[PDB]
Write an enzyme that holds these catalytic residues in place. Structure first.
Site, PDB file in Angstrom:
ATOM      1  N   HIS A  62       0.805  -1.231   0.000  1.00 36.72           N
ATOM      2  CA  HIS A  62       0.000   0.000   0.000  1.00 36.72           C
ATOM      3  C   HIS A  62       0.838   1.280   0.000  1.00 36.72           C
ATOM      4  O   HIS A  62       0.293   2.346   0.284  1.00 36.72           O
ATOM      5  CB  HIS A  62      -0.918   0.066   1.221  1.00 36.72           C
ATOM      6  CG  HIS A  62      -1.929  -1.015   1.311  1.00 36.72           C
ATOM      7  ND1 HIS A  62      -3.195  -0.870   0.794  1.00 36.72           N
ATOM      8  CD2 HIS A  62      -1.883  -2.227   1.903  1.00 36.72           C
ATOM      9  CE1 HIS A  62      -3.892  -1.959   1.054  1.00 36.72           C
ATOM     10  NE2 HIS A  62      -3.104  -2.817   1.720  1.00 36.72           N
ATOM     11  N   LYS A  66      -8.415  14.538   3.607  1.00 34.73           N
ATOM     12  CA  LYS A  66      -7.462  13.428   3.661  1.00 34.73           C
ATOM     13  C   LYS A  66      -6.426  13.780   4.733  1.00 34.73           C
ATOM     14  O   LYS A  66      -6.322  14.948   5.114  1.00 34.73           O
ATOM     15  CB  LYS A  66      -6.771  13.226   2.314  1.00 34.73           C
ATOM     16  CG  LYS A  66      -6.131  14.476   1.738  1.00 34.73           C
ATOM     17  CD  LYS A  66      -5.680  14.331   0.301  1.00 34.73           C
ATOM     18  CE  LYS A  66      -6.808  14.275  -0.713  1.00 34.73           C
ATOM     19  NZ  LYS A  66      -6.945  12.942  -1.348  1.00 34.73           N
ATOM     20  N   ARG A  67      -5.668  12.780   5.206  1.00 36.83           N
ATOM     21  CA  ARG A  67      -4.599  13.048   6.162  1.00 36.83           C
ATOM     22  C   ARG A  67      -3.657  14.107   5.565  1.00 36.83           C
ATOM     23  O   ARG A  67      -3.501  14.199   4.333  1.00 36.83           O
ATOM     24  CB  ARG A  67      -3.866  11.754   6.552  1.00 36.83           C
ATOM     25  CG  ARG A  67      -4.680  10.812   7.436  1.00 36.83           C
ATOM     26  CD  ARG A  67      -4.868  11.341   8.853  1.00 36.83           C
ATOM     27  NE  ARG A  67      -3.649  11.406   9.660  1.00 36.83           N
ATOM     28  CZ  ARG A  67      -3.268  10.466  10.522  1.00 36.83           C
ATOM     29  NH1 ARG A  67      -4.036   9.413  10.733  1.00 36.83           N
ATOM     30  NH2 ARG A  67      -2.131  10.590  11.183  1.00 36.83           N
ATOM     31  N   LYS A  81       0.605  14.726  -0.532  1.00 35.89           N
ATOM     32  CA  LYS A  81      -0.788  14.965  -0.912  1.00 35.89           C
ATOM     33  C   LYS A  81      -1.013  16.446  -1.285  1.00 35.89           C
ATOM     34  O   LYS A  81      -2.082  16.800  -1.828  1.00 35.89           O
ATOM     35  CB  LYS A  81      -1.717  14.569   0.238  1.00 35.89           C
ATOM     36  CG  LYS A  81      -1.841  13.078   0.497  1.00 35.89           C
ATOM     37  CD  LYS A  81      -2.592  12.800   1.789  1.00 35.89           C
ATOM     38  CE  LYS A  81      -2.621  11.338   2.175  1.00 35.89           C
ATOM     39  NZ  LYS A  81      -3.543  10.575   1.307  1.00 35.89           N
ATOM     40  N   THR A 108      -8.636   6.673  -2.130  1.00 36.47           N
ATOM     41  CA  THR A 108      -9.995   6.139  -2.136  1.00 36.47           C
ATOM     42  C   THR A 108     -11.042   7.230  -1.935  1.00 36.47           C
ATOM     43  O   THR A 108     -12.175   7.064  -2.402  1.00 36.47           O
ATOM     44  CB  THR A 108     -10.182   5.045  -1.088  1.00 36.47           C
ATOM     45  OG1 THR A 108      -9.779   5.596   0.163  1.00 36.47           O
ATOM     46  CG2 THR A 108      -9.423   3.794  -1.461  1.00 36.47           C
ATOM     47  N   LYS A 141     -14.898   8.176  -3.621  1.00 35.70           N
ATOM     48  CA  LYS A 141     -16.090   8.551  -2.868  1.00 35.70           C
ATOM     49  C   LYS A 141     -16.782   9.764  -3.485  1.00 35.70           C
ATOM     50  O   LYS A 141     -18.001   9.813  -3.597  1.00 35.70           O
ATOM     51  CB  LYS A 141     -15.742   8.883  -1.424  1.00 35.70           C
ATOM     52  CG  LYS A 141     -15.220   7.678  -0.655  1.00 35.70           C
ATOM     53  CD  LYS A 141     -14.573   8.124   0.640  1.00 35.70           C
ATOM     54  CE  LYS A 141     -13.731   6.998   1.196  1.00 35.70           C
ATOM     55  NZ  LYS A 141     -13.074   7.344   2.439  1.00 35.70           N
TER      56      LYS A 141
HETATM   57  O1  LIG Z   1      -4.024   5.299   2.946  1.00 41.11           O
HETATM   58  C1  LIG Z   1      -3.001   4.645   2.917  1.00 41.11           C
HETATM   59  N1  LIG Z   1      -2.155   4.465   3.965  1.00 41.11           N
HETATM   60  C2  LIG Z   1      -1.106   3.716   3.588  1.00 41.11           C
HETATM   61  C3  LIG Z   1       0.012   3.346   4.465  1.00 41.11           C
HETATM   62  C4  LIG Z   1       0.309   4.110   5.590  1.00 41.11           C
HETATM   63  C5  LIG Z   1       1.366   3.752   6.413  1.00 41.11           C
HETATM   64  C6  LIG Z   1       2.133   2.642   6.123  1.00 41.11           C
HETATM   65  C7  LIG Z   1       1.845   1.881   5.013  1.00 41.11           C
HETATM   66  C8  LIG Z   1       0.791   2.229   4.181  1.00 41.11           C
HETATM   67  N2  LIG Z   1      -1.182   3.364   2.342  1.00 41.11           N
HETATM   68  C9  LIG Z   1      -2.430   3.889   1.764  1.00 41.11           C
HETATM   69  O2  LIG Z   1      -3.268   2.802   1.410  1.00 41.11           O
HETATM   70  C10 LIG Z   1      -4.493   3.174   0.753  1.00 41.11           C
HETATM   71  C11 LIG Z   1      -5.309   1.908   0.585  1.00 41.11           C
HETATM   72  O3  LIG Z   1      -4.765   1.040  -0.406  1.00 41.11           O
HETATM   73  C12 LIG Z   1      -4.191   3.896  -0.560  1.00 41.11           C
HETATM   74  O4  LIG Z   1      -5.407   4.310  -1.200  1.00 41.11           O
HETATM   75  C13 LIG Z   1      -3.323   5.118  -0.288  1.00 41.11           C
HETATM   76  O5  LIG Z   1      -2.925   5.675  -1.543  1.00 41.11           O
HETATM   77  C14 LIG Z   1      -2.088   4.757   0.544  1.00 41.11           C
HETATM   78  O6  LIG Z   1      -1.419   5.930   1.015  1.00 41.11           O
HETATM   79  C1  LIG Z   2     -11.649   7.524   2.416  1.00 41.06           C
HETATM   80  C2  LIG Z   2     -11.086   8.148   3.672  1.00 41.06           C
HETATM   81  C3  LIG Z   2      -9.638   8.442   3.723  1.00 41.06           C
HETATM   82  C4  LIG Z   2      -8.726   8.182   2.548  1.00 41.06           C
HETATM   83  O1  LIG Z   2      -8.824   9.305   1.674  1.00 41.06           O
HETATM   84  P1  LIG Z   2      -7.702   9.643   0.561  1.00 41.06           P
HETATM   85  O2  LIG Z   2      -8.246  10.910  -0.071  1.00 41.06           O
HETATM   86  O3  LIG Z   2      -7.641   8.459  -0.371  1.00 41.06           O
HETATM   87  O4  LIG Z   2      -6.449   9.873   1.366  1.00 41.06           O
HETATM   88  C5  LIG Z   2      -9.104   8.995   4.873  1.00 41.06           C
HETATM   89  N1  LIG Z   2      -9.874   9.263   5.929  1.00 41.06           N
HETATM   90  C6  LIG Z   2     -11.195   9.036   6.001  1.00 41.06           C
HETATM   91  C7  LIG Z   2     -11.942   9.381   7.252  1.00 41.06           C
HETATM   92  C8  LIG Z   2     -11.900   8.439   4.873  1.00 41.06           C
HETATM   93  O5  LIG Z   2     -13.252   8.219   4.949  1.00 41.06           O
END
Ligand SMILES: O=C1NC(c2ccccc2)=N[C@@]12O[C@H](CO)[C@@H](O)[C@H](O)[C@H]2O
Ligand SMILES: *Cc1c(COP(=O)(O)O)cnc(C)c1O
Ligand SMILES: O=C1NC(c2ccccc2)=N[C@@]12O[C@H](CO)[C@@H](O)[C@H](O)[C@H]2O
Ligand SMILES: *Cc1c(COP(=O)(O)O)cnc(C)c1O
Lengths: 806, 806
Positions: B347, B538-539, B544, B646, B650
């Site tokens: 990921h 998003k975080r 980002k 993701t 949404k």
């Molecule tokens: O949201 C995410 N967190 C991490 C991640 C954080 C810390 C350590 C390892 C991985 N990977 C992520 O996985 C999502 C789900 O596949 C992807 O949509 C995101 O692009 C990616 O950033």
């Molecule tokens: C979907 C979701 C995320 C991931 O969003 P990205 O735009 O793909 O980073 C993070 N936090 C919450 C609360 C979500 O519902």
């Protein structure tokens, strides 16, 4: 099955079965193919708990409408035991549930054994609180028990190689179905900070906040549809690097983590003081909130606060703090309210048990309360000075502040000064308070000092634990005695009834067979059920003189060995109890008991004439098993040391004869049954004092009693510790040079008296007639009588046996 | 009210009301005079939970009878959000409960807001796990989510003076009605100790034991009567001076205390490694126990283990340990089983996120696992040597063991070696894995590498959060699309339908009015609902590029000021997200955002043309509110850095247009909708690489773009921080000298592209037609499609939409 357990109605049973299956499916999320016996216990618990709820809600509603005066029993200990059977008894559901469970193919008795004791107390004091709650509900008082919900109660005891090991009593592991969390009634408690004096007045600032979250447990009265509340507080961190901050929340929540198990020696531990303030602060806020839902002149007409020993003594300075600092009452008015509200029960005279908190500790943790205590002390000592001009010694003796190495606050002094009533817990104990340790206070305020002799609830301690004895009594005199125990006197008219004599002896033998089996099953060793069951169960203390019992046991052994081929009344000597974990001597005594057992129980020549058993993990649920099985109750504390005792009363009620000293409530027990129906021996209180004046020389006894000298040589030489010859040198040395409780002084009279017991046991019919004379006069020792006396003479409310609507 | 929420039958509603009052009385122990809105929420929760139970019990029973292959989704994170509404939707109970609650005089929507998010995850990864669980249940897979029940989830975020403050997310305070404790399934987990080699084999001895107690949460499939289980483990001390020993139990239980919130930078913290082993050890025991209730050759036919990143990578050495040390299989057989069982999802490609555990840490905590890892490494590198003779560099690069300052284990390397399948989470990301970071492994085992593009559940992310949009779609094409999202393509036939255009735009405006009100209520400031809602949630991460957004916002401001009296499409720019607590730059960005807001939102000349809002405490339940309200979705990560994203999906589903880079799943989104229906800008991955080869000089951009130079001068001089002129010097310095994510490189194209957005927004009808083209092609991004691909191509099971009996 038996009538005192209630009716099994056709609807009732069908209903219970339906609810049971409903909770199994929906609450437990199980089908019958995967249900563990624990699931079944939980399903039953929820089902029974469902019958409490309407009564609980209506009772609390009734108190809102009627707005009666409310009683707050403040205690650090509530030794509740199991709740399931007690709830069924008091709601009259026992037979219906037995039938309903039977029809589902379950044995209810097996399910009852799955329930953990709520072991939130050490012994007598904690259990007294629990008996009081049951009586307060039964007498229709608007009473609330307030304490701490400890995550860990009194440790579980294992014996390893004869030694006590402690294990954490993780009683909440599987959940507690009896309690209801009330997070919406969460209250802040403050610690540390410092005091600012402003124009408005003193202000307590820069404090640390811990939250107190209440859990309510229902307390059902006996078939009166009253359900009172026990509210226990749990510590929770407030919600305002990162990882460690989160983990550090544990420190705040440590406050309610664990019951302090040292029932012998007051240690001024900060965490313990935190517990004491925590319960006091959260409770008084709750009290006051409730009081306002309906000006403080009326406060003492609407509120009584009972202090269970000094453990919640800070209630007195806390109430002043709230009234003065937060409500802005002047001192005198505030004080008047406090004194009329508060009442103090003393539960010991042993000086090492009195709470004497270092000032530096209070200074740091509760700076404002220390200020208030000093002001109380000053005003109090001004009244003493006026009454007794020139008696400077009296001033020093009565001060709330003790001078010396470190300055201490004497919390008992604080309690007497701030309470309208001070009571002891047996007549002899209340006399000793007035003659010795509180003589000065008595001379100042004679009107404050009362007696309230202790009691036990006949619900748990007869109906519940001894249904067969309850039944044969009910067969003759009806069921009314269960909530009016004085009716037991009607049994005097059956002392020569041959069939009642037969019934009483049959029940006892059945209880012994039952308990003998329980030993063999849970702790695999064999015992002669036709032997005299000699039991001493209570916490291990030097003053309770388990050691005297040990001496008697070794005497019987030595006599058998000397004359092997002579008859003796066979005995099973059972001794059980926990030692406080840091109490070295108590730990040595347990070890000595097991060491004696190892020798006696393996001697071929003794056979089954004599057996010595240490009962592991003595707790409330073990007491309900062994006490009905007992023939002889050992109540052998040195005169003047046992404030009351309550085990003594449990055994009297359950058909055992008592061997004991004229100590505590033993005195009143012997008085009620007649001295000729009681195995009294030993020094009176007066005798102990005469000995102390000229000096206790134990050597004198060792020199003059050959039998005793033999025992001491055996202990010394390693007769009872072969691989470790000098294991018991601490015990011998104490007995010979440093025995505060004068074990040797009572040895001769104890052994002679123990012979008279054996002699009477030889005569079944006369033994049983004596038993009837005990049971029949045990009425006074109902906690219903005790609480009725508290109500009328301290709290200023009238009890009631009238039903609430169902 | 609306049809997709189900039927309100006369019986159903009466039943729900009856159960609600039953739980209020008996579960909550309240009457209606004292019930808090929270009580009402809890009563409803229990009532709904009651409709899960039979389905749960029967589903698990069905899996026992049928014994299908079982899927174990192993994750440290499950970002579940609220359970109540989701449960009602999936059981078709929503309208019935709305009606039943209405008739009791309650508003269900208000009760829903009382439920806490289960925030047991950081962001995308955690949420993906939650979406997968819903899809696995909906597709009738015998799937289990296994993780940790953290006492504290992701911290609650407060902004104070523009800064992020963290607060403990105490989500269990009031109880969790969704979970069922299963203390009878408690399992030991071992730590520390040392390895003995005997005749029989290696033995792991002198370990510390922590217990793992499972809590099961039901996972309902969409109207198929399937209810799968999420099992989360909680740490409990084993039950074998005194006071401190009791208190020290906290240390063992710290393992499950708190979710690690650092989603940016791998820190090799021991407590984190304890968490990883704890979930892995407890889970594999459970897996194996279940497997045995029905010889290990069949193990991979009955068991698939999916590893959610490397966080549970120790599953691979743990499975070997159990098979070799405890089951006594030979290495090769054990290994064959392990590889066929395990599959790894990657990921991220950002190197600071890869888990590289120091050897000394593993050596101490998990000595046996380190031995096994070394053996794996040796056998693996023997296969590499044979395939690529002489390529010593390759050996070093592929080793599980990294040499250097401190020796580390590369857990990703371990996962590739021990898994039959390795996948990325979007096509471009899976290509990058094969071209760059795992090129060597790909060359060895090309067959292992797959793509599984991510998805979102249309249940939570359409039906639940946007019922009005769901309804107008269902009006045209029926309800089948909710579990077959590709059916949305049928909406292409309505792109010129005037009434559907009207409906789509009406729903959006309603969602904006609703959210505008929510802002004013919960966080009192006013926003123009007729503005373009520009949201980036998003975080907070440099990659980002919230900072790029900040630059655009300041550009719009500077343009307004320059030409105040000119028309601009008005905007509300909303940015929200949590920064990892130790991530300084992310904390500075939040502050900069709020600093911009303070300037822009108080400028009289701007008026309501431009507003900048920082959305506090972004979490799952805030996403369900703001995403339906959005017009423009900001997906502006530097090409090659966002593995998938993701949030992007949404917003597409919920009727917002996307401005974004050709990164992650954006590429596939634009491909599905057509590039002409997507606001694509910026460097491709290839462009970034070309820049890196010659070197990124940010100065070049500062020199050539006057607009940009102005912004940088404003930041420097304190235009946005008057009282603290140099507050943002860290941000400027990074942008000018140390910007890994090339913010300036994409600035010009972003601003031009942002103009094209404004231009289209000026034309409501063509904006809405473009929206329809997005919604209509969002079908691919259903997690149902994703999971179906996992099932067929990795797990070797067939999905099913067939109902279980009700
Ligand atoms: O949201 C995410 N967190 C991490 C991640 C954080 C810390 C350590 C390892 C991985 N990977 C992520 O996985 C999502 C789900 O596949 C992807 O949509 C995101 O692009 C990616 O950033
Ligand atoms: C979907 C979701 C995320 C991931 O969003 P990205 O735009 O793909 O980073 C993070 N936090 C919450 C609360 C979500 O519902
Ligand atoms: O059991 C008891 N514990 C304590 C006590 C322990 C520590 C500190 C203070 C008091 N007092 C006791 O109270 C009982 C109830 O009144 C009496 O029956 C006992 O004789 C007395 O010993
Ligand atoms: C009654 C009781 C006690 C108190 O017994 P004494 O003989 O008065 O010390 C202690 N422990 C338990 C478990 C009890 O039931």
């Amino acid at each position: 099955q038996i009538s005192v357990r209630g009716l099994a109605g056709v609807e009732n049973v069908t209903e219970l079965k339906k609810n049971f299956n409903r909770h199994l499916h929906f609450t437990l999320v199980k089908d019958r193919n995967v249900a563990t016996p624990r699931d079944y216990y939980f399903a039953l618990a929820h089902t029974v708990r469902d019958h409490l709820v309407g009564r609980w809600i209506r009772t609390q509603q009734h108190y809102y409408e009627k707005d009666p005066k409310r009683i707050y029993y403040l205690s650090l200990e509530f030794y509740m035991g199991r709740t399931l059977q007690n709830t069924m008894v008091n709601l009259a559901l026992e037979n219906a549930c037995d039938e309903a469970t039977y029809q589902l193919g379950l044995d209810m008795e097996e399910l009852e054994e799955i329930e953990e004791d709520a072991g939130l107390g050490n012994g007598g004091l904690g259990r007294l609180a629990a008996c009081f709650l049951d009586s307060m509900a039964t007498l229709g008082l608007a009473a609330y028990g307030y304490g701490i919900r400890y995550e860990f109660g009194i440790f579980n005891q294992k014996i390893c190689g004869g030694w006590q090991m402690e294990e954490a009593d993780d009683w909440l592991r599987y959940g507690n179905p009896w309690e209801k969390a009330r997070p919406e009634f969460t209250l802040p408690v403050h610690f540390y900070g410092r005091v600012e004096h402003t124009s408005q007045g003193a202000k307590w600032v820069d404090t640390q906040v811990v939250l107190a979250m209440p859990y309510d447990t229902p307390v059902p009265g006996y078939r009166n549809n009253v359900v009172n509340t026990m509210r226990l507080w749990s510590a929770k961190a407030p919600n305002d690097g990162y990882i460690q901050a989160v983990l550090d929340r544990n420190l705040a929540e440590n406050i309610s983590r664990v019951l302090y198990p040292n029932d012998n020696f007051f240690e001024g531990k900060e965490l313990r003081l935190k517990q004491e303030y925590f319960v006091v602060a959260a409770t008084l806020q709750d009290i006051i909130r409730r009081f306002k839902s309906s000006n403080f002149d009326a406060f003492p007409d609407k509120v009584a606060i009972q202090l269970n020993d000094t453990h919640p003594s800070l209630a007195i300075p806390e109430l002043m703090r709230v009234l003065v600092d937060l409500e802005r009452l002047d001192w005198d008015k505030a004080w008047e309210v406090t004194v009329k509200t508060c009442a103090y029960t003393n539960h010991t005279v042993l000086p090492e048990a009195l709470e004497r908190w270092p000032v530096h500790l209070l200074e740091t943790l509760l700076p404002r309360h220390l200020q208030i205590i000093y002001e109380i002390n000053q005003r109090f000592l001004n009244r003493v000075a006026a009454a007794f001009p020139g008696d400077v010694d009296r001033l020093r003796r009565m001060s709330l502040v003790e001078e010396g190495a470190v300055k201490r606050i004497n919390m008992a002094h604080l309690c007497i000064a701030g309470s309208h009533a001070v009571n002891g817990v047996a007549r002899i104990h209340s006399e000793i308070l007035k003659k010795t340790i509180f003589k000065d206070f008595y001379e100042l305020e004679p009107h404050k000092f009362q007696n309230k002799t202790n009691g036990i609830t006949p619900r748990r301690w007869l109906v519940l634990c001894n249904p067969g004895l309850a039944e044969i009594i009910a067969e003759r005199i009806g069921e009314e005695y269960i909530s009016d125990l004085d009716q037991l006197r009607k049994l005097l008219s059956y002392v020569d009834d041959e069939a009642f004599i037969r019934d009483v002896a049959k029940v006892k033998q059945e209880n012994k067979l039952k308990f003998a089996a329980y030993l063999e099953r849970e702790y695999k060793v064999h015992i002669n059920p036709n032997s005299l069951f000699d039991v001493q169960v209570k916490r291990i203390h030097e003053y309770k003189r388990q050691l005297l019992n040990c001496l008697h046991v070794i005497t019987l052994y030595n006599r058998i060995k000397k004359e092997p081929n002579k008859f003796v009344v066979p005995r099973t000597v059972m001794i059980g109890g926990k030692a406080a974990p840091g109490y070295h001597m108590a730990k040595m005594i347990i070890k000595l008991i097991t060491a004696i057992g190892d020798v006696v129980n393996h001697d071929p020549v003794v056979g089954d004439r004599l057996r010595v058993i240490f009962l592991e993990n003595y707790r409330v649920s073990l007491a309900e098993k062994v006490i009905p099985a007992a023939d002889l109750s050992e109540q052998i504390s040195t005169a003047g040391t046992e404030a009351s005792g309550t085990g003594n009363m449990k055994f009297m009620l359950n058909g055992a004869l008592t061997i004991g000293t004229m100590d505590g409530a033993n005195v009143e027990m012997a008085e009620e049954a007649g001295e000729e129906n009681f195995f009294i021996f030993g020094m009176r209180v007066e005798d102990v004092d005469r000995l102390d004046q000229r000096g206790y020389n134990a050597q004198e006894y060792y020199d003059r009693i050959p039998e005793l000298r033999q025992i001491i040589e055996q202990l010394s030489s390693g007769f009872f510790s072969p691989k470790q010859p000098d294991l018991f040198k601490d015990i011998v040395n104490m007995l010979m040079h440093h025995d505060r409780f004068k074990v040797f002084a009572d040895y001769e009279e104890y052994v002679k008296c123990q012979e008279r017991v054996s002699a009477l046991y030889k005569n079944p019919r006369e033994w049983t007639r004596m038993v009837i004379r005990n049971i029949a006069t045990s009425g006074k020792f109902s906690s219903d009588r005790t609480i009725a006396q508290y109500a009328r003479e301290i709290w200023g409310v009238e009890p009631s046996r009238q039903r609430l609507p169902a």
